[PDB]
Structure formats: structure tokens, C-alpha cells
Scaffold this motif. Structure first.
Motif, PDB file in Angstrom:
ATOM      1  N   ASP A   1       0.812  -1.233   0.000  1.00 58.65           N
ATOM      2  CA  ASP A   1       0.000   0.000   0.000  1.00 58.65           C
ATOM      3  C   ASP A   1       0.844   1.282   0.000  1.00 58.65           C
ATOM      4  OD1 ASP A   1       0.587   0.717   2.712  1.00 58.65           O
ATOM      5  OD2 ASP A   1      -1.431   0.255   3.409  1.00 58.65           O
TER       6      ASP A   1
ATOM      7  N   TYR B   1      -9.050   0.288  -5.303  1.00 57.67           N
ATOM      8  CA  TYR B   1      -8.557  -1.064  -5.267  1.00 57.67           C
ATOM      9  C   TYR B   1      -9.609  -1.982  -5.875  1.00 57.67           C
ATOM     10  CZ  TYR B   1      -5.139   1.212  -2.377  1.00 57.67           C
ATOM     11  OH  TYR B   1      -4.134   2.045  -1.936  1.00 57.67           O
TER      12      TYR B   1
ATOM     13  N   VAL C   1      -5.306  -8.130  -6.647  1.00 59.62           N
ATOM     14  CA  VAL C   1      -5.683  -6.736  -6.447  1.00 59.62           C
ATOM     15  C   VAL C   1      -4.913  -5.820  -7.376  1.00 59.62           C
ATOM     16  CG1 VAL C   1      -5.812  -4.780  -4.876  1.00 59.62           C
ATOM     17  CG2 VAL C   1      -6.274  -7.068  -4.023  1.00 59.62           C
TER      18      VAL C   1
ATOM     19  N   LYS D   1      -4.553  -1.714  -8.334  1.00 59.34           N
ATOM     20  CA  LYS D   1      -4.759  -0.331  -7.928  1.00 59.34           C
ATOM     21  C   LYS D   1      -4.980   0.502  -9.186  1.00 59.34           C
ATOM     22  CE  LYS D   1      -2.399   3.390  -5.382  1.00 59.34           C
ATOM     23  NZ  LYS D   1      -3.574   3.833  -4.566  1.00 59.34           N
TER      24      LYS D   1
ATOM     25  N   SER E   1     -10.140   1.555  -0.207  1.00 62.34           N
ATOM     26  CA  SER E   1      -8.825   1.312   0.389  1.00 62.34           C
ATOM     27  C   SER E   1      -8.521  -0.190   0.389  1.00 62.34           C
ATOM     28  CB  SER E   1      -8.749   1.901   1.813  1.00 62.34           C
ATOM     29  OG  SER E   1      -9.654   1.243   2.665  1.00 62.34           O
ATOM     30  N   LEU E   2      -7.236  -0.546   0.488  1.00 59.54           N
ATOM     31  CA  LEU E   2      -6.790  -1.914   0.342  1.00 59.54           C
ATOM     32  C   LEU E   2      -7.493  -2.878   1.266  1.00 59.54           C
ATOM     33  CD1 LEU E   2      -5.031  -4.113  -0.882  1.00 59.54           C
ATOM     34  CD2 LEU E   2      -3.225  -3.496   0.708  1.00 59.54           C
ATOM     35  N   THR E   3      -7.638  -2.514   2.513  1.00 63.28           N
ATOM     36  CA  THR E   3      -8.285  -3.378   3.506  1.00 63.28           C
ATOM     37  C   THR E   3      -9.759  -3.049   3.635  1.00 63.28           C
ATOM     38  OG1 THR E   3      -7.528  -1.743   5.155  1.00 63.28           O
ATOM     39  CG2 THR E   3      -6.282  -3.726   4.960  1.00 63.28           C
TER      40      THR E   3
ATOM     41  N   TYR F   1       1.030  -6.606   2.088  1.00 64.62           N
ATOM     42  CA  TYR F   1      -0.055  -7.507   2.440  1.00 64.62           C
ATOM     43  C   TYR F   1      -0.084  -8.707   1.509  1.00 64.62           C
ATOM     44  CZ  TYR F   1      -2.015  -3.571   5.020  1.00 64.62           C
ATOM     45  OH  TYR F   1      -2.261  -2.588   5.913  1.00 64.62           O
TER      46      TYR F   1
END
Ligand SMILES: [Ca+2]
Ligand SMILES: [Ca+2]
Length: 517
Positions: free
Chosen positions: A253, A357, A350, A352, A394-396, A259
């Protein structure tokens, strides 16, 4: 004897309560109507049915393009010294991935080369190992790829296997490999573990070599709460339960943290069981749809059983800051799960794009609980594969489905044809915030398409990502095994139509129901 919550949804569904059986009433009375999400965003029973129906309609927005079958070749680098037999053989090549920039996901340029890692093995043998390949960066020819050989060496056996993952560049221009270590010594079970190792390569006059494999270790193999463990699977498996702990995708990220997004099943946070048939959240349609779906599930033993064992998950965890010896720093709840609905969702990935994301994944829909839906896909197309997709800020963050249901790509030709595809894997495209290049493998394994028809690298094609959370397949197509889109990469000769998507004989060939059932 209906209770009042059940009464409520029967009426809204337009159902005459006097038409219900004792068993139907008893079932509706067990139904839990909680709205609390326990294991991330779910692929609901309704989403799945919608994905299948979309595949059946063969809608141009989502169908995999037809490929001209006559242009398709076995990859020359897949003829190579086999990891197990130590003899040069023509190998099936399937799940493959480029070495990517850990931040942007772009295909990395390593000293003027592109690098790919690929699962290969001899057709009709249990031979699952990974191999390192190279070509000149931007080179578009399938036949210019070269095979360095198995990453974990010759004299390998089926006791210890390597399945899919991902790979990126470290700061010093070593490669950090993420893969799946599979130990089959406990009575041939596929005991899967996410593993990592550092690869050191050398570049000599256009020849790339694997100098050293270092720091090979297990990163994670499930915890029991968020993700199912081997011991859990083993304790209850009488043959109906999948086991999944694989396909780890590494991604860093904006804040510099790495991650892993990976394939698994839920743990005790929201575990498989007959109880999942009675969680309203899982159905995700209107009242009529949910009730019809409940009764269908209880009336067909195969669907009931599958629903009882289904809990695919796409998981996420944070790694520590040690590039070369990654270890789990934090575990999280799954980004996506499919309790009651499917027990296999693979190759999570994933990408970006802009400030968002996009989470993609491939699935064989015949791993789902809804037998009617996937059987009907089989009748329509001769296959049941798809890529699904979601987006978060967002990533999470919380991931939401694209094209309403999660559908992104749907099967377009029979599983036993030469041009069949699977393991859709999208790669960013330099200079574009609204396109990904979709790679895949072509021709299903073990000679189901014919003698000498090895699994090979498909032609790749662009997929457009629209700002309203829809997607559109584009008619732009590359040579086989192109990981890097640019203007120079388009090849109109590869484009097929329904007619030229089959080799002679293939239209008139029976389905292979062992494969798609
Ligand atoms: Ca399961
Ligand atoms: Ca290219």
C-alpha cells in the motif's frame, strides 16, 4: 405453525401460508434474520445465480472473446526437463504470473527482461511444480520465452509440491516469491501452506540463470478463526469438503506495508455447517427468491450437502517489514466470503487504479451449491468458469461487487475445446487508469482437448474499468503469452468467432461431463 418473522416474509413474497408443508414451516421458523456481516462482503446465493445467468446469456460486456483456434500453439518453453522424471517432456503449463512491481503491479523490467513464474507438469501425472521463465521486456512472441527450469530443482517428487502465488522485486533487485507449499505425506492430502523464498538471478549475455534460492519458509497456513486450518478440515472431512490455503498475492500500500491477499475457507468466525442454510444474509434476493431458494436447497440432497460445506474466502493479512523473510504481522477478516454458496474461489488479485482497489478472482461455478445454475451454464456454453470482481476505496476497505453481482468475465466455449480458458489474471497497463490486460491459460489439462494439446498461455485481451463500477470487455487482443500491453502488441489475427473458435471436429464432440460436472 409460522412464527411472526417468517409470517412477515411469506406475506411479502406473495405466498399463501396455507400452501406450506410442515417441513417448509419448520424451516422458515429456524431462519435467522440477523443483518450483521461476520466475514466481509459475501457472494450471496442471489449473486451466484445472477453470475450464472449472465454467463448463460453470453452478454458481450462480459464474455471472454472468441480466440482463433488455428493460431494456437503449445508454448515451446513448456517442452523442458521435468522436475520429477528428470527427462525433457512437453508439459501442461497452467497458472502463471509475471514478476510485478510490488506497489503498482506493473510487469517488472529486470535488467531488460520480463520474468514469469509458471506451474507446469506432465499431462496425466501428478506433477505440480513451478518454473522460472524469461523473455526480453516487451517482446511479443510466445516462442521467445525461455525456461530456466524448476525453481526448487530436479529430483522433485509429488510428496512436496509447489502451487500458485505471486512475485515481486526486492530493493536489491532480487525476487521475492510467494507460493503455495503442499505437503502430501499425510495420506496424500493436499495440505497447503503459504510459503515464500528469495530468488537471486544472474544475467549473462542474454542468458538468465537462477543462482540461488534462499530463505524458504512457511508464512501462514490458517489460524482457525478467520481461516480454516488443515486440522479443522481433517477432523470433519468425509470427502465433501474442499481445502484451500493458497494463491497468495503480494501487494504494498501507499503507507509502505506489504499484504498478502489469498485463497482460503472461513474459520469459526463464520464457519461452514448446515446452520448456514438458515442464515438469511446468505441469500441476498427479495423474499420470494430467498424462500424459493431455501426450499430448493432442502429438497435436493446434493445442493443441501454442498450448501452445508461451502465457505470459500478471500483472505488478507499484513506482513512485517523484512522483505526477504516475510512473516505475518497481523491477521484480518476476509475481504470476501461465500458461505452456503461456493467452496472454491481462486487466484485473488488486487489492482490499484486511480484511487481505488479492484479485487478480482477466478472461479469454476461447478464448485457452487446451486446445481441448477451451474448445470444450466454447462448446457448453454459447455463450461462454467468466470472472473468475478469487487472494488474498495482502500486496500483493507470494504469491497463492493462490480456489475451488480460481481460478474466480470464469463466462459464462452466448452471446457474441452482447445480455446477454453481459466485462471483469469488481470495485469495493469502502463499509462492507463481504466484498463487492465487479462491473461489466462488456455486448453484444459491432461489432454481433455486431444492428444498433444497441452495447456498453454492464452492470448491476452483488454478489459475496461468504468467509473460507475461496471466493466467492459474490449476487442483488443495480443499474441499468446503477452503480459505487457502497448500499441505494438495488438494482433488481429488472434481474434476468433464462434465458428473459428473450434478446431475441425470439436463442434461435434460430446461434452466431457467428468470435467464440467
Ligand atoms: Ca468448506
Ligand atoms: Ca506486449
Amino acid at each position: 405453525k409460522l412464527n411472526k418473522d417468517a409470517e412477515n416474509v411469506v406475506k411479502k413474497a406473495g405466498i399463501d401460508p396455507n400452501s406450506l408443508t410442515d417441513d417448509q414451516i419448520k424451516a422458515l421458523n429456524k431462519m435467522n434474520f440477523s443483518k450483521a456481516a461476520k466475514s466481509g462482503t459475501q457472494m450471496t446465493y442471489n449473486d451466484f445465480q445472477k453470475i450464472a445467468d449472465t454467463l448463460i446469456k453470453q452478454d458481450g460486456r462480459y464474455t471472454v472473446p472468441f480466440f482463433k483456434a488455428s493460431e494456437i500453439k503449445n508454448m515451446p518453453a513448456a517442452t523442458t526437463k521435468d522436475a520429477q522424471t528428470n527427462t525433457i517432456e512437453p508439459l501442461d503449463v497452467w497458472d502463471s504470473w509475471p514478476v510485478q512491481d510490488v506497489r503498482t503491479g506493473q510487469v517488472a523490467n529486470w535488467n531488460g527482461y520480463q520474468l514469469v513464474i509458471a506451474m507446469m507438469g506432465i499431462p496425466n501425472q501428478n506433477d505440480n511444480h513451478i518454473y522460472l521463465l524469461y523473455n526480453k521486456y516487451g517482446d511479443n512472441e510466445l516462442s521467445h520465452w525461455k525456461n530456466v527450469g524448476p525453481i526448487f530443482g530436479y529430483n522433485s517428487t509429488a510428496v512436496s509440491q509447489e502451487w500458485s502465488g505471486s512475485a515481486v522485486l526486492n530493493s536489491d533487485n532480487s525476487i521475492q516469491l510467494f507460493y503455495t507449499r503442499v505437503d502430501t505425506s499425510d495420506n496424500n492430502t493436499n495440505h497447503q501452506k503459504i510459503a515464500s523464498a528469495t530468488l537471486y538471478l544472474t544475467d549473462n549475455n542474454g542468458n538468465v540463470s537462477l543462482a540461488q534460492v534462499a530463505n524458504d519458509h512457511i508464512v501462514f497456513e490458517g489460524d482457525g478463526y478467520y481461516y480454516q486450518t488443515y486440522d479443522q478440515w481433517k477432523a470433519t472431512n468425509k470427502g465433501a469438503d474442499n481445502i484451500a490455503m493458497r494463491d497468495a498475492h503480494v501487494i504494498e500500500d501507499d503507507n509502505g506495508d506489504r499484504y498478502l491477499v489469498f485463497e482460503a475457507s472461513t474459520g469459526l468466525e463464520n464457519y461452514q455447517g448446515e446452520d448456514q442454510i438458515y442464515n438469511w444474509l446468505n441469500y441476498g434476493g427479495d423474499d420470494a427468491f430467498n424462500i424459493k431458494s431455501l426450499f430448493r436447497i432442502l429438497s435436493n440432497d446434493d445442493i443441501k450437502s454442498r450448501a452445508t460445506w461451502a465457505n470459500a474466502a478471500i483472505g488478507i493479512l499484513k506482513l512485517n517489514k523484512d522483505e526477504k523473510n516475510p512473516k505475518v504481522a497481523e491477521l484480518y477478516s476476509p475481504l470476501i466470503s461465500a458461505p452456503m454458496v461456493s467452496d472454491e474461489i481462486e487466484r485473488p488479485n488486487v489492482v490499484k487504479l486511480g484511487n481505488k482497489y479492484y479485487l478480482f478472482a477466478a472461479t469454476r461455478l461447478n464448485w457452487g451449491s446451486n446445481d441448477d445454475a451451474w448445470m444450466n451454464a454447462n448446457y448453454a456454453v459447455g463450461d462454467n468458469v468466470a472472473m468475478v470482481g469487487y472494488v474498495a476505496d482502500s486496500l483493507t476497505g470494504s469491497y463492493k461487487p462490480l456489475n451488480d453481482s460481481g460478474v466480470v468475465l464469463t466462459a464462452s466455449v466448452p471446457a474441452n475445446w482447445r480455446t477454453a480458458t481459466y485462471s483469469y489474471y488481470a495485469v495493469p497497463v502502463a499509462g492507463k487508469d481504466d484498463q487492465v490486460l487479462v491473461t489466462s491459460y488456455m486448453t484444459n489439462r491432461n489432454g481433455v482437448a486431444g492428444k498433444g494439446m497441452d495447456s498453454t498461455w492464452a492470448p491476452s485481451f483488454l478489459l475496461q474499468i468504468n467509473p460507475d463500477n461496471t466493466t467492459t470487455v474490449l476487442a483488443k487482443m495480443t499474441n499468446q503469452g503477452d503480459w505487457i500491453w502497448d500499441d505494438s502488441s495488438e494482433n488481429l489475427d488472434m481474434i476468433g468467432d464462434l465458428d473459428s473458435a473450434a478446431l475441425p471436429g470439436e463442434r461435434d464432440k460430446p461434452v466431457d461431463w467428468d470435467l464440467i460436472g
